[PDB]
Symmetry: C2
Subunit: 284 residues, 2 copies
Amino acid sequence: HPVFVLVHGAWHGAWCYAHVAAALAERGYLSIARDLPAHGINARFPASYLERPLDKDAFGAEPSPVANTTLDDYATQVMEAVDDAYALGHGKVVLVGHSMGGLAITAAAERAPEKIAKIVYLAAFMPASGVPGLDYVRAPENKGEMLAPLMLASPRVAGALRIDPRSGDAAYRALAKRALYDDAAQADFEAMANLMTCDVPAAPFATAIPTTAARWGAIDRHYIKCLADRVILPALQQRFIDEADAFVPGNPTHVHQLDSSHSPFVSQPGVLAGVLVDIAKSIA
Amino acid sequence: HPVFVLVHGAWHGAWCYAHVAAALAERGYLSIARDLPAHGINARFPASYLERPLDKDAFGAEPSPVANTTLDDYATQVMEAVDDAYALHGKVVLVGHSMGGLAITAAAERAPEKIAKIVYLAAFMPASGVPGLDYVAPENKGEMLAPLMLASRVAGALRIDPRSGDAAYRALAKRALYDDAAQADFEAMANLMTCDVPAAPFATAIPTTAARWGAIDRHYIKCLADRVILPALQQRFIDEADAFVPGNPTHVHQLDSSHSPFVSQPGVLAGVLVDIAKS
């Protein structure tokens, strides 16, 4: 039983994996899930976020207190989690990234592939060598992405992409659920929205990752494609898969289809845990 | 190495143990930290909580959406974590903080077999038959929670407002639970906290018996600058357990910390937990 390292996405924290981790633990699998820099217990909030009712002008303009967080910072934290998971002595690890977390795990795996048995992209950025995540967000394959209407700051002004999980506007809160959690129970959504933060560093999205076939490319590679994802659309998920397949011909991606929104860790954590166990048992 | 099960207290979640778990993991110790019923990913909020500026009248009066949560619910959840930790290849170290001491007490009495060591960190360690609301005690006079309470009574929960827009309230909250924390650490923790803690579990007596619960190697980590469960009250628990179970006295450890050493001195706390695990 390899140990899983679970890496969350933008505005989220390790808490989003709570149900999945419990299901894995019951199935006999250990997991390490930690907050990325600038997220969770590491979050910082603009003063404008705590002055209510929200002044959209001020909240749009305020320089982010997490603007200087980098993709390298993300990679460093993930690599530390891989180290600890490896040191627990069950061999090489299964490294899982969701959404923006795919950028962090990609960077980590190229820098230090040795301790990683399998790398898993759950509805995540799995970018081509040298291509920043932002290029994908604006790609034709992602036309329709439902995050655009939730944006409350210009990244050129704020140094972050900003949302308001504490909005008192019914339309905004409905859109947040439709975009990230359409298949979730309303109460589950509200509990997640309570834990979300408002600022995600902009710079990591504009940072190319210099992957190579011999390092990142050599790792047994899985993509869990979420067929009703409204933010990283299925066509964009498939572009990532097709690019990796062309890049490393002798090590094609192992694809796992899930009929889910972007957030199966809330809507079907038991099923997601089952896919992860399948991956852990898979033969490379 | 035994696996630690870490149980949090009122209005908090498993996230509060993140630094401690990481410190344990670097030292080769596994930990399972999960949200109690009604907390974290399981929380529910009164509709009143979503209107800002807050309507204190409405927020005080609204029936809690977690009013139906019971001590047995807490215990059942802790036991599942103990069951998973035991499988993941021997008896566990069960650690409860603050109200979490009520859950681990109930869980140990109900099923003491898989627990090697039980650790109370600035936590309710109630005498048999005594409900936690009884201790809420002359030993606890000066408790800094009182002026932050925002419900009666009508609500079926004790209510605070970690999302308050009021600077004085937020400053009091930090003084009561996190005085020794850096400001930005406090703000990140306060963002994750919830507002309603079920009232009913506090009113529920746990019928502990010296032969099950009382028989487990028992540790109390006293927090010397705790402003919520005062040292005098910790010590009342320790004394009541020692009397109840001559022959298996409580092992006391002291941290010069506030109620929240998982933010102020996580590494030190991890070191105490590792020492307990090796005792």
